[PDB]
């Protein structure tokens, strides 16, 4: 069953969405504060890359 891959993909969607510029969140930047604007883009680029990995892992369970 695709329970764990689907869970991991949903986890990457939220972390990417919670980190987005028009979003507000303090628990997605836990222990990460006063961040430079390019620094936030870097974390957004990392979380977007994690999403594409999760989507590929979840697709391969079909």
């Amino acid at each position: 069953k695709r329970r764990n891959p689907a869970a991991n993909l949903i986890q990457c969607v939220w972390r990417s969405y919670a980190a987005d510029e028009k979003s507000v969140s303090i628990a997605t930047w836990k222990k990460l504060e006063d961040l430079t604007p390019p620094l936030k883009t870097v974390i957004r680029a990392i979380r977007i890359m994690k999403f594409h990995v999760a989507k590929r892992k979840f697709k391969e369970t079909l």
């Binding site: 329970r3 969405y17 628990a27 222990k31 990460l32 390019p38 957004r44």
Partner: protein, 146 residues
Amino acid sequence: DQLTEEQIAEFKEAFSLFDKDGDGTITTKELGTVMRSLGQNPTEAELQDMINEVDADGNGTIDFPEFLTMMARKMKDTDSEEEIREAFRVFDKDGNGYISAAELRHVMTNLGEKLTDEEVDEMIREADIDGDGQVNYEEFVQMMTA
């Protein structure tokens, strides 16, 4: 929603923080340096996997065109919308289009890269906006697809 000239300048800025040697490519060694500088502890298999899924040309590294398409597309493409939607139906066993907030909070704190209680609290607050204990994942997907 399309990309302005300013955000492109900010995308190059962030790209140059990965491409620290300034040759216009991002390798697993450059990416791993940025991630572990942010408290992460990834393995090279994960580093190689992160490069591969955004390596459109397949040359092994990430150039700025690939980095730019990646940052502009977000999760808005059709393949992502159908896949994110299919990932939610795995837990929609009632087949109605709704998933209890208690069940979703449970699985997101017990499976995969599990969220902590602070992270999951913010997610349920946006998954179950009206607070009826039910999540309309079809409306939730389009929320984060944007």
